């Protein structure tokens, strides 16, 4: 029980993470891409819940070998991911196939604190298809916040910038009322960067974002 100030008059910083920060476990995370293509990538997501706001970072690593083939990245690199911190209760929303979260602070209930707030996103969340073309361009989201960054990668990629667009989402045929988070990444290259999507690009060509920080309202 309480002290000179009660331990729930005090908000507890909670922590969960998803994926593998060592990027030594392959590329088994599903990303949907424009025009009904897809990619498998690697990722690490670190989320803290403090005061009802979620502050997190997302870090994505990809290879051309596990990317689709055809088209031109330089002229066209865009991909969509879903974060489902409550995938244990709602497996069908885990569209990107993240592992279970790993709770570093809080109950086994803690994942539920990282669904996107129900009141404030009621009319700022996209409905997603359950199939492999659930990709939504950021101009189709009902609202988003934008986070600017730049990845690194193989030498001739010649990246010029990057943007992360966060928008909560719901999947058409779920088992719970909860909001997941949709994230579409747009990454650009100068005119002479190598065509990530080309068939004459060796498979070990890679890009790797830093951890990208973002914030949304928690549950």
Ligand X SMILES: NC(=O)CC[C@H](N)C(=O)O
> Which positions touch ligand X (CB under 6 A)?
52, 117, 217-219
Q: How far is the CB of 19 from a copy of itself (least distance, A)?
A: 11
Query: Binding-site residue total for a copy of itself (CB under 8 A)?
Result: 62
- Give the separation between CA 94 and CA 207, rounded to whole angstroms: 24
Distance (Å, whole) CA 64 – CA 203: 5
User: 19-48 mask for a copy of itself (x: CB under 8 A)?
Assistant: --xx---------------------x-x-x
Q: Output 45 or 187, the one with its CB closest to ligand X.
A: 45
**What residues contact residue 67 under an 8 Å CB cut-off, 6+ apart?**
39, 196, 197
Interaction between residue 51 and a copy of itself (CB under 8 A): yes
- The residue at minimum Cβ distance from ligand X is 52
Q: Which of 153, 132, 137 is closest to 209 using CA atoms?
A: 153
Q: Which stretch binds a copy of itself (CB under 8 A): 73-81, 86-94, 145-153, 194-202?
A: 145-153
- Tell me how far, at minimum, the Cβ of 177 lies from a copy of itself, in Å: 17
113 close to 106: Cβ distance less than 8 angstroms: yes
| Residue 198 within binding range of a copy of itself, rule CB under 8 A | no
**Residue 30 phi, psi dihedral angles, 5° rounding:** -95, 125
């Amino acid at each position: 029980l309480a002290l000179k100030v009660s331990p729930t008059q005090t908000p507890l910083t909670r922590i969960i993470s998803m994926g593998n920060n060592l990027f030594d476990s392959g590329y088994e995370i599903f990303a949907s891409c424009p025009q009904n293509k897809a990619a498998k990538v690697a990722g690490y997501v670190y989320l803290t819940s403090v005061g009802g706001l979620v502050h997190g970072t997302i870090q994505i690593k990809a290879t051309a070998g596990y990317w689709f083939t055809g088209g031109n990245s330089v002229q066209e690199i865009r991909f969509g991911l879903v974060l489902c911190p409550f995938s244990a209760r709602d497996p069908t929303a885990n569209l990107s196939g993240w592992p279970a979260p790993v709770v570093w602070s809080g109950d086994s209930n803690t994942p539920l604190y990282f669904a996107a707030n129900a009141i404030s996103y009621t009319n700022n969340r996209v409905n997603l298809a359950v199939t492999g073309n659930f990709y939504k361009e950021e101009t189709e989201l009902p609202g988003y916040t934008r986070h600017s960054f730049c990845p690194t990668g193989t030498t001739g990629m010649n990246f010029t910038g990057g943007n992360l667009y966060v928008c909560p989402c719901t999947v058409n045929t779920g088992a719970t009322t909860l909001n997941a988070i949709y994230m579409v990444f747009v990454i650009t290259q100068s005119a002479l960067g190598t065509n990530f999507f080309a068939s004459n690009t060796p498979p070990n060509t890679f890009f790797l974002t830093p951890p990208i920080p973002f914030t949304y309202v928690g549950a």
